[PDB]
């Protein structure tokens, strides 16, 4: 919207908002990232520490399918199921435990996080962290691995 912007507001002022003295020309400090080593050093650093050099090993042709582990930590674990069951599987009779398999929801790994409630659970996942399964084997629940 050309009304609201500045070049209507600054139409009549002779130097048009770029100084009488520097008088903005075309490219005074080199084009793009020019001089990251030499004269824009103080600006390339302090604001980008780490920018210059090798850091790691090469992995030629990495495939973005085998580092694929989407992760639920346990506080999102009861909301994969209908909440009509977690009240139903909490009726005082027995250890009526439902399965909660993350691998039909898009997750492969159960990471640890505190505050799981006090119902008995069985969880099918491909990967468990040792904080996570002791957060399940402390509520009277079990941890069934499958792939």
């Amino acid at each position: 919207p050309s009304r609201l912007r500045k070049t209507r507001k600054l139409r009549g002022h002779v130097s048009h908002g770029h100084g009488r003295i520097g008088k903005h020309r075309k490219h005074p400090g080199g084009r793009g990232n020019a001089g990251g080593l030499h004269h824009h050093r103080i600006n390339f650093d302090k604001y980008h520490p780490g920018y210059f050099g090798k850091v790691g090993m090469k992995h030629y042709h990495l495939k973005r399918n085998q580092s694929f582990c989407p992760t639920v930590n346990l506080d999102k674990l009861w909301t994969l199921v209908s909440e009509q069951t977690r009240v139903n599987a909490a009726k005082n009779k027995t250890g009526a435990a439902p399965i909660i398999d993350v691998v039909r929801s898009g997750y492969y790994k159960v990471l640890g996080k505190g505050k799981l409630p006090k119902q008995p659970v069985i969880v099918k996942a491909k990967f468990f962290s040792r904080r996570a399964e002791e957060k399940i084997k402390s509520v009277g629940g079990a941890c069934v691995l499958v792939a």
Binding site: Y47, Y51, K54
Partner: protein, 187 residues
């Protein structure tokens, strides 16, 4: 002449809200009628939070609310929050707290009303309490955004903790000199 000040004489705060929301303009006109007539402060704190921007009215989650109301002295009071209440899922059980806010979400107002709560907006609050007596006023974590963790001293000097802007968090992106002493120097 008078002095040699550098001017802060023009205050810079909000006085009329920049949104053209005609429903918020019917809540400014209610409260700045009640701000200067209450001879108290709870309106004059609500009246300036209806001015504030979209960022400075952060989304207060449900579980911050039901934790700050379990303190000794907040047992049956009606919690007021300027901003939107979004529900959390990390908590399991929701009591029958009574709240009063703009724009509770669709899932939260199920979970409040099914457990027997009551939600309000700022027009059935005035009839209940012109003073706003017996409430707790809440606000969300206004420094919770990912913007505020870019902000610190400078992402280069000692004790930085500033999260410098890269286009992809990964290897060979800002990790070579400035981060480890074996290559170049360490901040």
């Amino acid at each position: 002449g008078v002095d040699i000040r550098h001017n802060k004489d023009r205050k810079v705060r909000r006085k009329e809200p920049k949104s053209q929301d005609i429903y918020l303009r019917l809540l400014v006109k209610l409260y700045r009628f009640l701000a200067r007539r209450t001879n108290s402060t709870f309106n004059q704190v609500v009246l300036k939070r209806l001015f504030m921007s979209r960022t400075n009215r952060p989304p207060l989650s449900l579980s911050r609310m039901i934790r700050k109301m379990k303190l000794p002295g907040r047992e049956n009071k009606t919690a007021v929050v300027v901003g939107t209440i979004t529900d959390d899922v990390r908590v399991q059980e929701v009591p029958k707290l009574k709240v009063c806010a703009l724009r509770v979400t669709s899932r939260a107002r199920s979970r409040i009303l099914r457990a027997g709560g009551k939600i309000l907006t700022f027009d059935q609050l005035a009839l209940d309490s012109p003073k706003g007596c017996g409430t707790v006023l809440l606000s969300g974590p206004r420094k919770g955004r990912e913007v505020y963790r870019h902000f610190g001293k400078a992402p280069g000097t000692p004790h930085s903790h500033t999260k410098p802007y890269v286009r992809s968090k990964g290897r060979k992106f800002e990790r070579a000199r400035g981060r480890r002493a074996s290559r170049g120097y360490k901040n």
